[PDB]
Amino acid sequence: GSSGSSGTLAKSKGASAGREWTEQETLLLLEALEMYKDDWNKVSEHVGSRTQDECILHFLRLPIEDPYLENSDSGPSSG
């Protein structure tokens, strides 16, 4: 089924337990993406609790870049 150019899709997560990227991690990934942009081996190390593979994936997950749009707030300290 094809409607538009972009591959429309939705992700439903709630019960499936496993791994999760925390706002903290998300940033780390970027920090390295600047220095070890290509050097994945290091990237996986920069983060801390992530492997080369995982890192690569996460990278292809983040939302689209916007010119001007108020993003969510850090909020409380999620435990």
CA distance 8 to 3: 8
52-55, long-range: CB within 8 Å, 24+ apart, which pairs? 54/19, 55/29
Q: DSSP per residue over the chain, as a string?
A: ---SSS-------SS--S----HHHHHHHHHHHHHSSS-HHHHHHHHSS--HHHHHHHHTTS----SS-------S---
Residues 6+ apart with CB under 8 A from 31: 46
CA distance 43 to 28: 9
According to the entry, how was the structure determined?
NMR
Cα-flanking dihedrals φ and ψ of residue 54, to 5°?
-45, -55
Tokens, residue 23? 């706002």
Q: What's the gap between Cα 71 and its chain centre? A: 15
CA distance 57 to 54: 5
Which residue type occupies 40? W
